[PDB]
């Protein structure tokens with residue numbers, strides 16, 4: 001006798017498990033057990049993943065309902081599971097979106113300058129270099145401080161909340177609340193700080209005192225700062241780190257992008273498509289009985305949308321494991337999700353990775369792993385797959 005298939009399958013972000021293609025072929029929606037002991041439906045084909053993400057009756061907000069089957073324990077207050085809905089209801093969606101585009105004057109130059117400075121420092125120090133802790137994550141952190149309008153020197157402490165905030169735990173995490181409450185206090189102080197006049201927080205600070213927003217809560221304004229910093233920094237730092245591994249393990253592609261940096265955007269789109277950074281399926285709770293393939297999902301059941309299930313589906317992306325720069329459907333992957341919850345930072349995430357990779361290939365055209373790939377240490381019970389250190393030489 002065996003127990004019900006458990007998720008997630010592997011914390012390794014450098015290879016997709018054979019099980020994903022097996023499930024997709026044989027049972028593209030099937031029952032699994034999560035780390036909390038709950039049962040859930042794991043969806044692993046492009047067609048079914050898109051169906052679930054495009055049907056609002058599969059609800060993110062409702063995953064926070066008391067007594068629901070859970071993927072993992074909340075690390076934020078339950079109301080924050082409705083974060084984007086709260087932002088939209090407050091009439092703040094357009095302003096938040098506008099503040100986090102990569103198109104602000106000087107922002108891309110700041111990204112380039114920061115990436116180049118980080119790389120110069122690594123070169124000065126000598127190989128081996130850690131491309132996660134000393135490149136990708138600081139680049140993500142510096143970017144988000146700039147985007148938010150907050151001091152660069154405040155980034156590191158905010159960043160250090162993230163190894164706990166983005167845990168994927170069976171049980172509540174006391175440290176997550178300590179850090180959350182502290183980080184909220186910090187953002188509340190930022191809103192009251194007359195020096196903060198630029199970026200997302202400068203704009204929220206002005207809107208907070210505009211009569212058209214007088215009944216939006218201070219709680220929401222501070223929450224937007226903490227959540228956009230955290231989701232943006234964890235997602236961009238983790239994606240760039242694992243994309244760097246994908247590229248290092250493809251010297252022919254690495255050389256092509258070095259020789260023809262104008263192909264970097266197409267390269268980054270394929271790196272997004274094959275990315276294994278999301279450690280868990282995207283969770284939704286059914287709010288009605290809904291037919292998904294061969295399964296009638298019942299009201300109150302948990303559904304997990306496996307992004308790599310969709311993104312490696314050969315019926316949508318032929319030769320799915322191969323990076324191909326000339327696909328006819330290159331942005332149709334689900335790396336940024338789909339539907340109501342489509343990533344609001346997608347353009348910024350693309351630009352962070354493009355500029356990071358452009359700078360790395362210019363400064364370190366000979367970049368390679370400095371340890372056998374199996375020696376990377378993959379973070380466990382986390383909402384992202386990332387190596388603890390990424391040692392390289394050049």
Ligand code: HEM
Nearest residue numbers: 084231232235236239282335336337340341343345348349
């Ligand atoms: C390569 C980088 C990124 C990747 C791969 C990524 C991926 C995703 C995905 C898959 C979702 C959908 C989650 C779901 O449907 O349950 C999402 C949502 C979200 N992301 Fe991103 N993200 C990235 C960068 C960013 C950035 C730069 C920001 C902000 C500065 C951001 C903020 C958010 C927020 C607030 C949501 C929730 C949206 C909603 O619920 O409507 N992300 N992201």
Ligand SMILES: O=C1N[C@@H](Cc2ccc(O)cc2)C(=O)N[C@H]1Cc1ccc(O)cc1
Nearest residue numbers: 076080081082083084165166226227230231
């Ligand atoms: O619960 C939320 N929390 C925040 C994201 C977030 C989670 C934890 C944290 O410490 C900070 C931000 C949100 O914007 N919306 C929801 C849904 C969500 C969760 C994770 C994620 O990567 C994206 C969306």
